[PDB]
Design a protein around this ligand. Sequence first.
Ligand code: HEM
Ligand code: HEM
Ligand code: HEM
Ligand code: HEM
Ligand SMILES: C/C(=C/COc1c2ccoc2cc2oc(=O)ccc12)CC[C@H](O)C(C)(C)O
Lengths: 457, 457, 457, 457
Amino acid sequence: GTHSHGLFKKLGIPGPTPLPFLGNILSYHKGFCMFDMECHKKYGKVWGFYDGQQPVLAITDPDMIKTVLVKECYSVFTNRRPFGPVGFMKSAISIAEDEEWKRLRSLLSPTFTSGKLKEMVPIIAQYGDVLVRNLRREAETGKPVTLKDVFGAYSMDVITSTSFGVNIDSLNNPQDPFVENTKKLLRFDFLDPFFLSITVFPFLIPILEVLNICVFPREVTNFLRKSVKRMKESVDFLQLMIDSQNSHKALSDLELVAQSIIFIFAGYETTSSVLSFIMYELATHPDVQQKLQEEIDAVLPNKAPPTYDTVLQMEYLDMVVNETLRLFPIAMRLERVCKKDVEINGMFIPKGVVVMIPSYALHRDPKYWTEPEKFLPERFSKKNKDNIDPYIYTPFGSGPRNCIGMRFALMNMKLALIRVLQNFSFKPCKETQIPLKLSLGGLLQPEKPVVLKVESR
Amino acid sequence: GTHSHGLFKKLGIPGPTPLPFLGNILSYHKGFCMFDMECHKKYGKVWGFYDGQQPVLAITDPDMIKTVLVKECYSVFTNRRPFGPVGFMKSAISIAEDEEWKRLRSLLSPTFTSGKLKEMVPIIAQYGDVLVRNLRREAETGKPVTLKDVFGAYSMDVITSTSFGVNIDSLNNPQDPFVENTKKLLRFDFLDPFFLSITVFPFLIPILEVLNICVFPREVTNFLRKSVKRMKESVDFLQLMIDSQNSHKALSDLELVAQSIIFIFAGYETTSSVLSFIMYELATHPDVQQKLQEEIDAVLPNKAPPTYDTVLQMEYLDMVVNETLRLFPIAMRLERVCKKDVEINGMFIPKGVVVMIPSYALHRDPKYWTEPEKFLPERFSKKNKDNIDPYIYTPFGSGPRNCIGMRFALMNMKLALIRVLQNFSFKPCKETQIPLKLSLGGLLQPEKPVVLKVESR
Amino acid sequence: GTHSHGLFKKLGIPGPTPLPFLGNILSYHKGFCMFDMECHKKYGKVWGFYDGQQPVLAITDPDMIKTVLVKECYSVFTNRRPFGPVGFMKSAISIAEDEEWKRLRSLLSPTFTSGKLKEMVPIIAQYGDVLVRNLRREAETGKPVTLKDVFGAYSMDVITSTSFGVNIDSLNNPQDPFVENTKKLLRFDFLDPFFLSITVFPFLIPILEVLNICVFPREVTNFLRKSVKRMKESVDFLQLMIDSQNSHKALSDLELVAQSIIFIFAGYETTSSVLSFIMYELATHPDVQQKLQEEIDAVLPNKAPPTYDTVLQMEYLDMVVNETLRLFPIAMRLERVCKKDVEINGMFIPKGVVVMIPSYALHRDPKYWTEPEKFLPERFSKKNKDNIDPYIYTPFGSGPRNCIGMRFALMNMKLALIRVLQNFSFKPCKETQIPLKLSLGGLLQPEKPVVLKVESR
Amino acid sequence: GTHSHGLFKKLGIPGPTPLPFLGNILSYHKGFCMFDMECHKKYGKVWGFYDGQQPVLAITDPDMIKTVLVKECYSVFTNRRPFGPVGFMKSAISIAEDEEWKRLRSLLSPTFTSGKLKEMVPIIAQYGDVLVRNLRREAETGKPVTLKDVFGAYSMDVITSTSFGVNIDSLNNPQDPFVENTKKLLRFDFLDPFFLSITVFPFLIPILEVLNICVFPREVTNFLRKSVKRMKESVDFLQLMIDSQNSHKALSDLELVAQSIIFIFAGYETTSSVLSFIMYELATHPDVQQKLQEEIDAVLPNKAPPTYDTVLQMEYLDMVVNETLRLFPIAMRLERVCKKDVEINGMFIPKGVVVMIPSYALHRDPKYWTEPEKFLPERFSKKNKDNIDPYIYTPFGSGPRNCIGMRFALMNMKLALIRVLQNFSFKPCKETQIPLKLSLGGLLQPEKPVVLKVESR
Ligand code: HEM
Ligand code: HEM
Ligand code: HEM
Ligand code: HEM
Ligand SMILES: C/C(=C/COc1c2ccoc2cc2oc(=O)ccc12)CC[C@H](O)C(C)(C)O
């Protein structure tokens, strides 16, 4: 039961010692984030562990991180860890591999350009107003608001109308067929019962794929696949893709449905979780919240509606976002499969190892960050935005295979915050978890949901 | 690839010849019902086929059927075909085996007595009124009603309030947390992609059970399991069970949740489908519908509300129900695992064969029924209700392991029909499928749903 | 990954704490024997552990052992742990279950009677002479003999000629087709790579059975199955079985081949291993060897050939055999599946637990045996053969399902020893492992094989 | 159950229609060879079928064959069909993939050069004499010789002494530890029970690999792996490899054991089967046998021993060998996995299709061969050795990935024949199967083994 459990002692790379079959997964009982810090402390800058029989080589040196993520990306480190069972979602850009991915990353890049984004801002802006009106209704009546629902509803109101042209007040219309399905599109908990069973028996993935079982539910996907058929057959992501097949080989039909779904998956709980973390930090730091409220009113006098250009104007906002993402990189880790034998920056890495960059832990490394547990938006000021190594702070990853939706994600979250801070202020409650505790699960998210008092300005 | 594909040629039992691995499942392309008639025609009164490597021995002789279902039930033919993956639903009475089942069938029988049923009629009767008001709203406005929704909603309005004490206008409140889950509780299509893959690779069931995959969704069950915890901790099925553990070993906690779930599963789409089939036949036979409307008004003058006793009074109603069930035994087949070697009525049956009684086909046998394709409620008159062999007409099966919910099912459906016929009459539409065609799937149900015109009296 | 890992803490039974998926198997790294002593020491007289997800309840009280092995044998504890993949060897008496086993234990019992055995002694006796002549050839030339080969060859020379009528000097004819196959029939190492993988993924057994993979090699079995066809079609086990189908249902054809194979498996390495252990103890205790040589010459003056009756006459011989089996019960454990819920001697045992009696450890319990590490044949004298509890000393198990081949095994080993001690004396070598160390594997057998000097008398 | 069973109807490529799960394997009941001719007849020059869910695209045009085997070999068609479970034999040159294979094909090519072969001829020649003396012993006594044993023994006598330096008269020493193992190294019957079960459930391969089950037996490999350790640590293949790691990365240790094993596998039953087929054809064509006997005596007057150079001198010999290989290409098919999307000679081939060249059938195509059922060595005369398309006659395949052992195989077989024809003549028997019938199994080999009369000259 120990296939390749000698690999790291052989190469002389240090690490914790594995059990048979389980490898090191018993050590995930405190989450990846906590597991990654301990190993950074113990074994220094490079170590290895086993997810089952799967060797994983952690790296924390920025020259070496760059070679993985940037330089040898097309040659050696092109794909993320095999992830299954996936069905037709094998065509989604984030699961596809090698040349199929390159084709798709090309076919979809001109959809995430600044120009196309600047054209999407009016759509996104309209569900800001929906959010505020869904918030004043919460704030008028004395009652502690649970952010995850009001924000979770907002990330939906945008995902839909930006990648299908569908305009829903999902909070107020929780039953439009569309709203049920797409809310079943949550990020995957890789320490939940199933995915841990996949790591111990990845020989079961082919079995599951054959049994037509999918991690992307077999019923959600069936609804959207035809719903797009009704859309196609009659300034958003779906349209910009339909264009990119009125010309690599143009995006097929099913290939298009796959991207739209993977966009929801990659965008829904990511955005919602970060918006929450930001409001938690503004609430538990009233000075920061006021300084930002003041910067918002300056650029936008008279509760003016935010634009693409006035969003890019506001620097304290940028610093708050970026500092929140430093504390809470909701990906936790970046990973690439090493598909040859290589020697990068003087270390031999055998074929088939998963190379892993422990973001969460590097973002909270005392060796690159002073007082790294503190919400301190000033590390990202124009004065200090220079002593920050872009291969240590990677909330969206780096390289050709980084977050294709980064500018969208950051513009989306910034408009929300702008309109919400314009109108309301956020004070803690007694029930607000202080200090916040992170779920020991496989998702970077708060143990207990964030609830705060909302008052109107 | 042919383990035991010689068994039936060895014993001298005739049948169609199997492919390797698939056995005879390619022959299910016209549904079990159509497959069963052909084999009855061809090979006579006893034949054998293979579901994968699983031999199944069909029988159509009533002395022999009785031995299986009645006599040697506890000794030889106690359990239905192994059905998985099931998780904790292995404790449901209909999936449990041998002594566990006997314990449960005992612990739950005094819940389906006439006395307890007669006490449940007022509850059931109240969602009759909900049904009619949900129907007049359909009938006031000129528009063809699709029965499956108005009736499907009714079977829900009763399942809930009779096995949990929860009172929902599920049609008008399609969002009460309770209504979403319990509507995901549909009968299993055993010719759908998954269950056919189970028949070819039943060696995959243990794998699925270990991966914590369930045929009873892992999320529906999680909602109900605690929802009962809130119910327990503060004249219906749930209460009568809570009593039966204030005393075999009293029903455990989880064992109770299992029964309530299996009741929904066994009762929801069964009832809805039969109510539809009955309305289809009343609509396409206006003479029968009028004769029954007339019998209803007699017993219940002035749109009087039906009672337990006036339901049992109405004989034409009984004949319509029973004749509909003859045409549409929504189970199609009865099955028992042969758990020893035996010789019943002079035939050797080896251990491990699935013995199967082809209800649908026997109900439409020209050899026991004249003009067996015709809706003819008079075969069930007190004059002819005698020339009917109870081992040929088995819409609820026979023996210790027949439908524990039979009197409930028949009383439930009869109250619906009574109140609906009192107030409305049902005429076809142009879009009404005539003749009705049965879905070639694994469920006895109409290809196209039943839509009819509803007019008010 | 912890299905039923709470069962023993729930019932209040103590034990070591399990890892997920692995249960306690990491604790088998010192063999079952050493694992069983520690648990006897620690948790007292009853404890529980997990082979994967499989709970196993150890018991060491003789009233309770008797209920399991003797009283409730037909009712509750009929079968040994499911053992697979087995193919047609599911018909072997030792793997078959419930009524199939009862049928076979009946059909084969009159083959292991004293009368039939007494008729087999001349056959067995002839390969005594073959053994001695294969030994004098070893002893004439100065060279340390490795017992396992000379004895292993003898157990073969008897297995063949007693269950097929085939007369081979397997040592001198190591190529007769028959000799190759039947030497591939070794007892199963349940801590070897494969069987440990079965305990962690017993959901893989059905898969293996379907892939036609067998633990009883698919080629050895193919040779014997037809070799018996040539035998049948033209005073030993094969003949006595062919008779028992010239009359429960008479033994089928394949059922007969299965028993003959399972006899080889159960008899080959068992006998060889015990004969070795006995010679080791005679060699490292020269007083015992001389006292037995002297008893042999008395009963059999002049190197007389042993008979059935003079074998039963020799009591010191009996004591040496029985005391060797106390130190080395080559089964180590006895096991029965608990197939209902029960309460035996005031302990609840849930359905599906494997109940296990730790022979090796009880035989070396200081609480029933003084100086239990010492070879002391006198504990079995007619004076002390009474203070010995037959449910503590179970080298062949007890009850209806004990070793059907016991009298044969004991008569077989005794004739070997008699003829070998008549002619030779056995002195250690420098290379003789002293003290003997037991293999930490899954078989009770010496780490290093036994080599001793043989000199002629 | 029909993943990608539409691919060939979609692309417009014709073929037989598949069953679910089985694809077309029911059509293998007459062997690949017979299946391939029918499809060549029916669908013309390009067709498609399914091995399970695995699409296979047959091609029979020589420009297109060349692109697959020669041109786009490194780019598109580098590997043979995934074949498992393989364990460490994944390092054998013939199973390894992509760059690992290129490394190995380089590291091992200078071992199959003419120069190295010419140095191996004296070794090979010595077991010619062993063969003849093992043959005169057969021919002196009047008795029909079964070629497969005398020749099978010869191919062993050479495999050993050319790839390990071990000199065995395996016929006369059938027990040297070495001889038992290496005779268990037979070519794989891909229509036997197991491998057909692999084609239907290739999702079971990962399971088997994890269970440590190997198609290259787990015991044969264990013997050789250490036997080489004794060899290494103290003019043949093993030595030439030990050199090639006294310098791509030099051949590792285990990588060397793997090649030696794969050499036995690729060389043992191949050579034996072809030598038989040649003797069958010489015996059933006495004119050819005499004309070759006469050519042998010319070049080698006085039963002179054959040399490397006099072997290359004899042209009728070449024609007999080459014409036998035309009738019996013991590979039957060549295959390459299509690892991108491509268009070769104007046909689109999707990623993941197995491209297959049906050698056996092309060699017996009436469209490239007149009277293609006839043993006619003259088609290979220097006059006609030109009208023969090297992509139609491919008994060793073509391209960078053709038979690395071709010159060895052809020199080996030619020396055997030379020395055997020098001394003996071969006449049929009454028991000689005439006409020869090919086994309908998955190996190209005679149904009934070849037996002929051997007389001495
Ligand atoms: C706060 C919000 C978000 C965060 C923190 C985030 C973060 C990330 C990270 C860390 C990765 C892995 C990159 C790598 O491997 O280096 C990733 C990949 C990706 N994200 Fe985002 N993301 C967010 C929102 C979005 C949105 C709105 C989209 C909309 C299209 C999106 C689409 C994707 C895609 C398609 C990939 C995979 C791209 C590829 O594999 O080529 N994400 N994201
Ligand atoms: C028209 C409505 C229904 C029909 C036609 C129907 C029919 C059947 C049939 C044919 C069986 C198999 C019996 C056998 O194997 O002989 C069965 C079993 C069963 N039904 Fe019904 N049923 C209906 C409604 C219900 C309802 C309302 C319940 C509510 C509790 C219920 C609970 C069960 C249970 C628990 C079993 C299995 C009992 C056991 O295995 O011991 N069914 N039903
Ligand atoms: C020193 C030699 C032997 C020893 C120590 C030995 C010991 C054992 C033990 C401990 C068991 C388990 C009994 C139980 O579960 O209580 C057993 C079962 C069995 N043994 Fe022996 N045995 C020996 C030789 C033989 C021989 C020569 C045969 C020849 C037929 C044989 C045939 C069997 C069979 C068939 C069973 C299973 C019976 C059943 O399951 O009903 N054994 N043996
Ligand atoms: C009559 C005897 C033989 C015949 C007919 C034969 C035929 C073949 C064929 C058809 C192939 C597939 C080539 C392709 O895919 O194009 C092959 C591959 C191969 N053969 Fe032979 N062979 C014979 C003897 C040998 C011998 C003696 C060796 C000794 C080393 C050998 C080693 C190999 C190897 C290693 C491969 C795979 C090479 C690679 O995949 O790169 N074969 N053979
Ligand atoms: C190496 C990884 C990177 C995560 O890349 C994403 C992220 C990260 C946050 O949200 C995302 C949405 C995405 O959507 C997509 O389609 C594709 C990628 C994606 C896996 C992260 C695992 O959880 C853990 C903690 C076990 O390593």
